[PDB]
């Protein structure tokens, strides 16, 4: 009661306290962050942000006591390739929100530190999840470039059709390119045409 | 025909929770668990022992995902030593 | 990187299209994240080279981010070129004093 | 709240230029561009691209001043009185420049770019040529323009 | 003691943004 | 409350204070103002005020992830050429209105200076916008004369038809010219007939 | 067939706001922003980084207009240095 | 990036060179966009050169965009051949002082 | 076919007001103005600058009548000097 509100007084307090903290260490290693996550290196020719592909090993679902079903190996195309304008950052994914509340006896003090700890580490988990999200993205487009290198997926096959001077006596456009992405990236299924690189 | 596995295994293969999940408070170990829909999906690298999954999963690097029935209490083998693990929620 | 570089053998460098020169061997140490032409103009002005461009810049900028320390200009341009691989290109004609920046043509 | 001062005070700035020109290390503060010329004799030893010890208090309080402005590019050149061979005074200056540049780049640099070179007093600012490394043509010079 | 030379009158933003208006249209005139 | 009215006491106060200020510096540089903005130099033969034309580069709208659409270059005819009587000034565009209100504790004084500042700089922005408006006008008719010089727009093609003595035993008019502007200025679309000036 | 761009980009290419717009209070920088209809149109010369426009636009002199989705927080690169920018409204 | 960076040798970069006529040697100022051939004619008469064109101008015009305020006519021609690309090309014969637009 | 001018211009060419008019209180100058029907008709000899009439008119001697839209504030050029003029009503 008084109990739970002393807790919850702590809860948001440590939570936002933690949020402010994680935000400055984000800022000081901001260089390091994109220094890792150079997205444009991964983007494509017509700034097509490449899709995120997913690995799978020993996918054994037993259906049941009578029948099981396993792949050795499995790929999931997620978030198919697309025209991007501005390439992704990390701060889109990792800049934790910070707001400051200060809006409100020994149980008061100790449960406020309780929740102080509690908001701290739930924010830490939140952070952790943010990190994992940016992993699975980055690794995913890596894997796109991988299986594209492996002939295991297809390119984005596009058509840029261009137009000359377009427009009327009140409006013209001197050159209108329009670009459609005709065929998306996709996992090829005839594996015979794949590309299997030995290394040395 | 059985299903292959979960593709949510492909999500919890890495550290994303599934959509709409509850972070199961894992205490005593490095595995992380989400309540998706009575079904915890747990990522780990440790070796699940007691309860048994409906779907098992590992990464390229041996990261397991187990689409696992609900336990409060989890068993892995750590190093030929065996660990009990408590969850909350 | 390994699997790309083994599925595809690299045939040529870019030093044949960017060779070095005296006054191209001054050194520099850079961080950058902006667009390319501002950067290359700053280079050509410290290198006393006339800077020119060929073709038209696309609407989406090609943006690079170079971060290196105490390193000479010729392979500054080489890794800029690499960082703007297949969207931009650097050539230098140092018999003249010219750094030229070709754009992509789509 | 956003900044009045960007963590600096013009009083501290002028305290610097006063004292370091009392100490003689010359600050040019011209138009918008700001320059420091330094005799290389106080820093490198004789024909060496090698710095000494008590110099580094002075070198770091240079970098302390360098923090006082928003800036983009810093150019350092050094010059040395002609000693043996045009290659090596190029080299000696070039190394001298690059080593103090390395040091302050490692130190606080707010530049985005540091250009570095030096020449064998190919452009001597005096032709009073009293000797080698006690000449003021043995020197090192840093320019920037204070960004906005 | 230290002073940069061209110590002018105190301007104001109004006429300032007038000036950058003016020069932009002005050199449009030049090129035009 | 008392708060917000102390603010709003300041708000109009600094606003109108600023308005009076900007009005005198308008007046002292009035010469300079039209000395820039000689409109009659831009007006046409039959005092046709020329239309305002609009520039466009790299008009890339991505429609979406799948298709983008860019002109290199684009022109918008706005406010088509017309008979004007009296040519424009600037004071039509820049004379900020000034009215004076004086119509009504430490929060009173400080929020009155708050709003004093606030009305000041919102008026400054207002001013800024006024300036921008007169830009885009002036540049627009410049561009009309430009593309007219470039054969990229058309002239105002008119017909003046004249009448002799017109009128009855109670009213006459000894000479009645009527002038219709038959064909307005408009961007030509066959660009082959354009005019591309190299300069030296 | 996609649309060309906004022609309101041609308006906010220069300093007019679009018709019926709200001056978004730009703090920290020289770019000016209007709320047209959930869509800020921002003029600048700076190089937009984080959010990405639906339509981009530049002048003859490199003045950009970006028909931009609503951000509270804007990213440009200034000089290879990168600036966050706050807006109000 | 290195292993997927394909480039051409400057021996085989296929572009127009600087034809080093002194009538070519002058600085100019052009901002313009559209069909190339009109500019080539007008720059030829700027350069005191004759302009011939061989080939057919297509129904869709080959379009360019050049925005320079002070620059030499030769590297106008350099960029112009660059933006001409596959559809068209520029030859300059400074001995006969004629530029010539080649279609494809 | 456009109208010639107002014939009320022929009336206010001289000093009669139009029928049913309100004497607009002209302060600062010698021009006299009447509100006819939202339309001031102003006689003067001075040279109208800012607002622009629907119909202009002059006498044999250069007396102008201008069938003029409503301004509170009138501009003439006097002698190459330019005068603002306030009206009331």
> Comparing C-alpha atoms, which of G29, G34, G25, G35 is closest to residue G47?
G29
What distance in Å separates the CA atoms of residue A143 and residue G82, rounded to the nearest whole number?
29
What distance in Å separates the CA atoms of residue I85 and residue I89, rounded to the nearest whole number?
13
Nearest residue of H to residue A43, measured between CA atoms? H1
The 10 Å Cβ neighbour count of residue D98 is 22
Residue of F64, F124, F129, F132 for testing the chain G interface, max G β-carbons within 10 Å: F132
CB B82 within 8 A of CB B50: no
User: Which residues of chain C neighbour G80 with C-beta distances below 8 Å?
Assistant: 31-34, 38-39, 65
CB F93 within 8 A of CB F130: yes
Measured CA to CA in angstroms, residue A97 lies from A21, C37, F18, G73, G77 at distances of 11, 35, 38, 12, 22
The 10 Å Cβ neighbour count of residue B50 is 12
> Comparing C-alpha atoms, which of F20, F14, F5, F19 is closest to residue F104?
F5
**Residue C95 buriedness (CB in 10 A; 0-12 / 13-18 / 19+):** exposed
- Pairwise CB contact (< 8 Å): I52 & F85: yes
Q: How far away is chain G from the Cα of A99, in angstroms, using its nearest Cα?
A: 14
Cα angle vertex B67, ends B10, B83, to 5°?
115
What distance in Å separates the CA atoms of residue H57 and residue H37, rounded to the nearest whole number?
9
Q: How far away is chain E from the Cα of D32, in angstroms, using its nearest Cα?
A: 9
CB G57 within 8 A of CB G13: yes
What distance in Å separates the CA atoms of residue C2 and residue C6, rounded to the nearest whole number?
6
Nearest residue of E to residue F138, measured between CA atoms? E25
Look up residue G45 and give its DSSP letter.
S
**Annotated resolution, angstroms:** 4.2
Measured CA to CA in angstroms, residue H42 lies from F148, H15, H36, H49 at distances of 18, 22, 10, 9
- Pairwise CB contact (< 8 Å): A85 & G4: no
Facing residues of A161 across strands? Answer: A178
What distance in Å separates the CA atoms of residue A15 and residue A22, rounded to the nearest whole number?
11
Residue of H59, H60, H62 for testing the chain A interface, max A β-carbons within 10 Å: H60
Residues followed by a break in chain I (C to N exceeding 2.5 Å) are none
Q: How far away is chain H from the Cα of A77, in angstroms, using its nearest Cα?
A: 23
A vs H: CB pairs below 8 A = 15
Q: Which residues contact I44 (CB under 8 A, 6 or more apart)?
A: I29, I30, I31, I32, I63, I64, I66, I76
Measured CA to CA in angstroms, residue A148 lies from A42, A194, B85, D14, F83 at distances of 12, 9, 42, 61, 64
The 10 Å Cβ neighbour count of residue E25 is 17
A188: helix, coil or strand?
A: coil
CB C36 within 8 A of CB C83: no
User: Which residues of chain D neighbour C70 with C-beta distances below 8 Å?
Assistant: 98, 101-102, 105, 116
Q: Which of A84, A86, A178 sits opposite G49 (nearest CB)?
A: A86
What distance in Å separates the CA atoms of residue A101 and residue F180, rounded to the nearest whole number?
69
CB I43 within 8 A of CB I12: yes
Residue of E9, E21, E23 for testing the chain F interface, max F β-carbons within 10 Å: E21
User: Which residues of chain C neighbour G82 with C-beta distances below 8 Å?
Assistant: 33
CB A172 within 8 A of CB A161: no
Nearest residue of I to residue F85, measured between CA atoms? I52
CB H47 within 8 A of CB H39: no
CB B71 within 8 A of CB B41: no
Number of H helices, E strands in chain H: 2, 5
- Pairwise CB contact (< 8 Å): B2 & A129: no
Look up residue H12 and give its DSSP letter.
G
Measured CA to CA in angstroms, residue C46 lies from C33, C72, G47 at distances of 19, 12, 24
CB D102 within 8 A of CB D61: no
User: What technique determined this structure?
Assistant: cryo-EM
- Joined together, the tokens standing for residue A190 give 């005839």
- Pairwise CB contact (< 8 Å): F60 & C60: yes
* Residue at token pair 């690299």: C10
H, E, C per residue of chain F: CHHHHHHHHHHHHHHHHHHHHHHHHHHHCHHHHHHHCCCCCCCCCCCEECCEEECCEEEEEECCCCEEEEEEEEEEEECCCEECCCCCCCHHHHCCCCCCCCCCCHHHHHHHHHHHHHHHHHHHHHHHHHHHHHHHHHHHHHHHHHHHHCCCECCCEEEEEEECCEECCCCEECCEEEEEEEECCCECCCHHHCCCCCEC
CB I9 within 8 A of CB I55: yes
For chains A and C, having 3+ Cβ pairs within 8 Å is answered: yes
* Residue at token pair 């392979």: C75
Residue of E11, E18, E19, E24 for testing the chain F interface, max F β-carbons within 10 Å: E18
Say if C106 is an interface residue toward chain F (CB within 8 Å): no
* Phi-psi category of residue G20: left, alpha or beta, with phi > 0 → left and psi -120 to 50 → alpha: left
Q: What is the rounded end-to-end Cα distance, in angstroms, of chain I?
A: 33
Say if H53 is an interface residue toward chain F (CB within 8 Å): no
* Residue at token pair 């305002």: F52
User: Which residues of chain A neighbour H39 with C-beta distances below 8 Å?
Assistant: none
For residue D128, report the phi and psi dihedrals to the nearest 5 degrees. Answer: -65, 110
Half-sphere exposure of H1 (CA within 13 A, CB side): 21
For residue C27, report the phi and psi dihedrals to the nearest 5 degrees. Answer: -110, 160
Cα angle vertex G7, ends G3, G12, to 5°?
135
> Comparing C-alpha atoms, which of F151, F37, F15 is closest to residue F87?
F37
What distance in Å separates the CA atoms of residue H43 and residue F42, rounded to the nearest whole number?
29
CB C100 within 8 A of CB C26: no
Say if C64 is an interface residue toward chain A (CB within 8 Å): yes
Measured CA to CA in angstroms, residue G82 lies from A195, F145, G50 at distances of 41, 40, 10
The per-residue b/e assignment along D33-68, b for 16 or more CB within 10 angstroms, e otherwise, is: ebebbbbbeebbeebebebeeeeeeebeebbebbbb
What distance in Å separates the CA atoms of residue A185 and residue I39, rounded to the nearest whole number?
69
Look up residue I55 and give its DSSP letter.
E
Largest distance between two CA atoms of chain G:
39
- Pairwise CB contact (< 8 Å): G15 & F132: yes
CB G26 within 8 A of CB G32: yes
For chains B and A, having 3+ Cβ pairs within 8 Å is answered: yes
- Joined together, the tokens standing for residue F54 give 């609009």
Q: Where are the beta strands (DSSP E) in chain C?
A: 27-31, 50-54, 67-72, 88-93, 98-103
Say if E31 is an interface residue toward chain H (CB within 8 Å): yes
What distance in Å separates the CA atoms of residue A121 and residue A143, rounded to the nearest whole number?
32
Residue of B16, B48, B53 for testing the chain A interface, max A β-carbons within 10 Å: B16
Q: What is the dihedral of CA D8, D13, D15, D20, to 10 degrees?
A: 130
CB A79 within 8 A of CB A140: yes
Say if B49 is an interface residue toward chain A (CB within 8 Å): no
Q: What is the dihedral of CA G66, G68, G72, G75, to 10 degrees?
A: -50
For residue A65, report the phi and psi dihedrals to the nearest 5 degrees. Answer: -65, -15
- Pairwise CB contact (< 8 Å): C32 & G47: no
């Amino acid at each position: 009661a008084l109990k739970e509100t002393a807790l919850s007084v702590g809860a948001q307090a440590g939570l936002a306290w933690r949020a402010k903290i994680i935000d400055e260490q984000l800022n000081k290693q901001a260089r390091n962050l994109d220094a890792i996550y150079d997205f444009n290196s991964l983007v494509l020719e017509h700034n097509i942000l490449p899709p995120v592909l997913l690995e799978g090993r020993n996918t054994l679902n037993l259906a049941d006591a009578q029948s099981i079903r396993i792949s050795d190996r499995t790929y999931k195309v997620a978030k198919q390739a697309h025209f991007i304008t501005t390439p992704p950052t990390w701060r889109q994914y990792l800049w934790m929100d910070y707001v400051k509340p200060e809006a409100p006896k020994e149980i008061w003090c100790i449960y406020t530190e309780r929740g102080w700890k509690n908001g701290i580490d739930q924010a830490n988990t939140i952070l952790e999840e943010n990190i994992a999200r940016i992993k699975e993205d980055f690794g995913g487009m890596i894997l796109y470039r991988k299986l594209l290198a492996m002939n295991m997926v297809s390119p984005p096959y596009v058509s840029h059709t261009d137009l000359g001077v377009t427009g009327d006596g009140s409006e013209i456009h001197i050159d209108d390119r329009v670009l459609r992405i005709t065929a998306l990236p996709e996992l090829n299924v005839n594996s015979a045409e794949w590309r299997a690189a030995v290394a040395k | 025909i059985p299903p292959s596995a979960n593709d949510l295994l492909l999500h919890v293969l890495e550290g994303v929770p599934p959509p709409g999940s509850r972070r199961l408070v894992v205490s005593g170990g490095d595995a992380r668990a989400w309540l998706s829909n009575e079904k915890m999906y747990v990522r780990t690298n440790l070796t699940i022992l007691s309860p048994g999954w409906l779907a098992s999963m590992t990464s390229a690097d041996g990261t397991h995902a187990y689409e696992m029935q609900k336990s409060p209490v989890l068993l892995v083998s750590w190093h030929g030593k065996v660990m009990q693990l408590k969850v909350e929620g | 990187a390994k699997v790309e570089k083994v599925i595809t053998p690299p045939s040529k460098d870019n030093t044949l299209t960017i060779p070095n020169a005296y006054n191209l061997q001054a050194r520099a140490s850079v961080d950058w994240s902006g667009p390319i032409e501002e950067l290359t103009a700053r280079i050509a002005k410290a290198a006393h080279f006339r800077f020119r461009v060929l073709g038209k810049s696309p609407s989406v900028p090609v943006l690079i981010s170079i971060s290196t320390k105490d390193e000479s200009l010729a392979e500054i341009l080489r890794d800029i070129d690499y960082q703007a691989g297949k969207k931009a290109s650097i050539h230098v004609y140092p018999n003249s004093q010219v750094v030229e920046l070709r754009y992509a043509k789509i | 709240l956003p900044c009045r001062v960007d963590g600096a005070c013009d009083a501290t700035i002028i305290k610097m230029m006063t004292d370091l020109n009392k100490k003689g290390i010359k600050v040019a503060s011209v138009g918008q561009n700001y320059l420091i010329s330094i005799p290389a004799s106080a820093l490198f030893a004789d024909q060496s691209p090698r710095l000494n010890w008590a110099s580094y208090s002075l070198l770091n309080e240079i970098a302390a001043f360098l923090k006082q402005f928003r800036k983009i590019a810093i150019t350092v050149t050094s010059y040395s009185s002609k000693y043996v061979s045009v290659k090596r005074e190029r080299a000696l200056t070039l190394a001298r420049s690059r080593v103090v540049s390395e040091y302050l780049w490692s130190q606080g640099v707010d530049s985005r770019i540091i250009f570095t070179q030096g020449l064998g007093s190919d452009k001597p600012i005096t032709s009073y040529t009293l000797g080698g490394d006690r000449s003021p043509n043995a020197r090192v010079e840093i320019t920037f323009r204070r960004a906005v | 003691k230290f002073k940069k030379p061209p110590i002018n009158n105190p301007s104001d933003d109004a006429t300032i943004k007038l000036a950058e208006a003016a020069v932009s249209v002005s050199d449009s005139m030049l090129e035009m």
